[PDB]
Design a protein around this ligand. Sequence first.
Ligand code: MG
Ligand code: MG
Ligand code: MG
Ligand code: MG
Ligand code: MG
Ligand code: MG
Ligand code: MG
Ligand code: MG
Ligand code: MG
Ligand code: MG
Ligand code: MG
Ligand code: MG
Ligand code: MG
Ligand code: MG
Ligand code: MG
Ligand code: MG
Ligand code: MG
Ligand code: MG
Ligand code: MG
Ligand code: MG
Ligand code: MG
Ligand code: MG
Lengths: 91, 115, 161, 62, 96, 97, 136
Amino acid sequence: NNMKRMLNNNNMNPAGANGNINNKLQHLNNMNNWNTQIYNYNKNMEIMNTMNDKLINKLLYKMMTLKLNNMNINKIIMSKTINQHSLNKLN
Amino acid sequence: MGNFRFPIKTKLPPGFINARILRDNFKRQQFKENEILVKSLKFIARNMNLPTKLRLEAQLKLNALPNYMRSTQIKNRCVDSGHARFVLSDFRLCRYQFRENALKGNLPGVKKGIW
Amino acid sequence: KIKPTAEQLAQWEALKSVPIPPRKNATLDHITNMIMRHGKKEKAQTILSRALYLVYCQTRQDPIQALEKSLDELAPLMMTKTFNTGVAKASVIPVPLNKRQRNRIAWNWIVQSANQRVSSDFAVRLGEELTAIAKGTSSAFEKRDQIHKTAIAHRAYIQLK
Amino acid sequence: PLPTRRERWTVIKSPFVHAKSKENFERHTHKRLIRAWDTNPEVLQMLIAYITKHSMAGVGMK
Amino acid sequence: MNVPKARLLKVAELSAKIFDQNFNPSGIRTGSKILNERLKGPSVASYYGNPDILKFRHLKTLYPDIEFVDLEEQYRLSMVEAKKRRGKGAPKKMKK
Amino acid sequence: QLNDYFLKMKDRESIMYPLQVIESVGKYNIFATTSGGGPTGQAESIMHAIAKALVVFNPLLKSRLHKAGVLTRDYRHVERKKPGKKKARKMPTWVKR
Amino acid sequence: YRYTSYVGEEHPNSRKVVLSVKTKELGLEEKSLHKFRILARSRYDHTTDIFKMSSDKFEHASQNARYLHDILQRLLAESKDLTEDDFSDVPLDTRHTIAKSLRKKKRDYEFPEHWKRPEDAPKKKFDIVDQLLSTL
RNA sequence: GUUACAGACUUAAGCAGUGGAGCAUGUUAUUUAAUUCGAUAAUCCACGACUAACCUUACCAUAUUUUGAAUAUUAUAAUAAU
RNA sequence: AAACUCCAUAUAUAUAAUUUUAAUUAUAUAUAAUUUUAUAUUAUUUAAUAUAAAGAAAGGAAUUAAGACAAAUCAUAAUGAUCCUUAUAAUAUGGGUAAUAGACGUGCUAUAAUAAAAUGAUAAUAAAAUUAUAUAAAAUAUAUUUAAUUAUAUUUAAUUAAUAAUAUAAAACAUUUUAAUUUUUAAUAUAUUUUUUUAUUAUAAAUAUGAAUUAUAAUCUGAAAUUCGAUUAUAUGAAA
Ligand SMILES: [Mg+2]
Ligand SMILES: [Mg+2]
Ligand SMILES: [Mg+2]
Ligand SMILES: [Mg+2]
Ligand SMILES: [Mg+2]
Ligand SMILES: [Mg+2]
Ligand SMILES: [Mg+2]
Ligand SMILES: [Mg+2]
Ligand SMILES: [Mg+2]
Ligand SMILES: [Mg+2]
Ligand SMILES: [Mg+2]
Ligand SMILES: [Mg+2]
Ligand SMILES: [Mg+2]
Ligand SMILES: [Mg+2]
Ligand SMILES: [Mg+2]
Ligand SMILES: [Mg+2]
Ligand SMILES: [Mg+2]
Ligand SMILES: [Mg+2]
Ligand SMILES: [Mg+2]
Ligand SMILES: [Mg+2]
Ligand SMILES: [Mg+2]
Ligand SMILES: [Mg+2]
């Protein structure tokens, strides 16, 4: 009975059997649904940040297409950027 | 004059520019510039204790201030588009434009309201 | 291991023979609901019980029972329900009534007859009407009789028979 | 866990008219509280500094 | 209110003196609410965004080595050229 | 006091009912503590709690209490206002013309 | 003195500092204490004997804290004066506190102590295998 | 303008309403210098518009701007950072 | 399509030094049902009804396919073609979008006694949500002889928030009043219905319903309230 209780206490694993959880390799973080991954306490500042991010995306898109002496125009395709706003740093 | 629409050379806002947007932005900048002054003039005007001639002069000055000094003149536009109806303050966007952005995932924490 | 004690067992045994008590007198509750309008059930209840109290005071015998008897008397056992009848003569048929429907018919008549009484308060009017019915006088009775006569005409219009 | 917020916003789905059809939107500000209880200020500062150094993506702090 | 009025007024005046807050016993329009209002101008100004943001013009300034292409601009130029070709170009502007 | 809190007799009757299905009204002291909702709903929640409390004193009566309809948590939850509709179900007027 | 700091952001509430003291913990005589409480007015709560005040007037947090300290000192000086100004006959105004209490809810009621039944409580059931095990 | 079932807020019960009154609001029509533009069977009509004093506005009257909000090309000159 | 999803529910675990407390809570993670079992009664091993015992076990939301309607949108935005380029582009001052014969929808308020109004401080009982482009508490002053209520002004306590404020929820329930109503009143007596009874005298189609319309005075926001805003007061008191 003690052994069973101990098992019950420790019974956790990756989900997908038929005491389990979805591990970080089994599902997306809901933060990776949004493109400006941010929380700020002043919402004005947060809005300004997300505007900036959106403007940078356009700039990046513009950059992505190059030219080579008017011979070849290699259009590098890029995804929509995802901006990770930690307290320390943007990524 | 010819070289600019308004008296003062202000910068263009980044991203979506529009004539109405331009007009609003300039107005906002002028309000920001001449906010304290306007407040001081208002105070001088609405004073029972101060000399009456001075308060009258202040009132006249306030009256003579231009279209672009007025706080009441400012109208919250959409930033992505240039609409001025159903403009939500928490993301400076118009109704349809907000929805479009929200469904895409541009918004920081917005999602479908399922209950 | 459950381990039921002796006293508890005895109590359970005692309970077993007794049936579960009903939470409402059903006909009364129905009447109160019909009286009620804007989800203001409490007011309807006060009106009804005040009327029943008045009835009791006028004639000292169980008011609820008397009301039930009145309903039974007044409620027409069947109704001549109209039909389209396959696009032809609108051939009416006697149809048997659910208890609620029977007592619903009675109540509307009772209410109407109360509304002809004098007082400002409806509860008083209602009580007076209930006492009159208990004693044995109303146009509601006449209406019921008429309904029964109309049902009696159209004997074999009933389909299954 | 302090209680989550809910910033709701409704919007007509169409770009023009069809105002009978409307869609909702919501945003939940999830709040958790930590409380330090006994520390010489310097240690607390260090902790806080360390926290902000290795901060995660979605999380704001006060 | 059995406690006297004058004493209460004196107490209120003293409290006002202690803190910075003013003491207006008469209840006259002083104009305090005009100035005391926090001025909201900078936030209002910051509505549309940060005007100094990187543009395509700058992407030539920062990185001359990379021959970038602004696609929308190029498209516009091509449209203009097409208009010129088929006699639908802009009329020459009056100066006076 | 009970008469001071619940003014409607119906609420009091409802509260009593778990003790009334058993022959134990008068046997058990009850100290109820409510929060949230309105009076009738509060009374109903108290009743529900009392039935569960009684169940511990004698487990053999649990089935009987369940049959009476006191051990069932009444789920009836207020429907939300949907967008186009005025209330939950109440729609604004239609006009075929 | 509680200070607040928003880490990544530049909130305008980072300047907010809040002083808060129990009035009995302050080094005062009884007459002076009463006077101090009177001067505090809405800032002094009477249920919890606490006086607190916050300042957001100045640009920086440190400034605000200093200002609050200066105010406190001034309040203390006023309390300890007593020269032609006692405030012995102005009762403690507790209207703001009762308003606050009304706004909130109360759970003051408790289970009657004479309703308790220790005799009806479940007694320790004898577990023999557990007893055998416990040899320590 | 068919056969026979099945369907539900379709009908039937039932409860409350609209339709009469005054007001609000949208629409129409007509008016107006302008009454900005669109929506106008069900699937328009407190709809686009989650607030028209100025603004917003797009309409009208009178004034006044003409490379103007951009990007690029070609020239003179001035200031600031290094 | 259903299902997974969200909300809500029941249970378990974790966390919260039970002063940010509401532990009767909040929030992460699970488990739970599109419920199960058995006895019978009809129709053919099953399927509907009934009964019973086991369970907290009962909803709502999102999702509305293909095609079609040349359905709606070029006034969210963008783009094709086309037209304007001292003008169909741009700025200011005022006016208009609020005009009013008839008509058409949606609402709101009504037309009084199963229904309206006064009052109700050891302040009867909620939820959900907002407050650094703020929320504004207590308290003083005026409307107002007490005061409360309601409305403004005075001045900002507290909090940028499970901590303070918006905000003592309201119906409910209780006393009082209520014209139409000589179905009441007040003068006398009257009395074992006394906040009342009886007797005899006098008490002779819109109100003590409704709140349109208008007059004057104040207040609020704003630089500005004439066209054209919102309150409060004293009058006005249509229609129904
Ligand atoms: Mg119908
Ligand atoms: Mg009509
Ligand atoms: Mg009408
Ligand atoms: Mg068009
Ligand atoms: Mg139109
Ligand atoms: Mg134009
Ligand atoms: Mg599905
Ligand atoms: Mg607690
Ligand atoms: Mg389809
Ligand atoms: Mg078409
Ligand atoms: Mg069209
Ligand atoms: Mg186009
Ligand atoms: Mg033009
Ligand atoms: Mg203009
Ligand atoms: Mg209009
Ligand atoms: Mg509509
Ligand atoms: Mg009425
Ligand atoms: Mg106050
Ligand atoms: Mg609070
Ligand atoms: Mg109350
Ligand atoms: Mg009339
Ligand atoms: Mg009236």
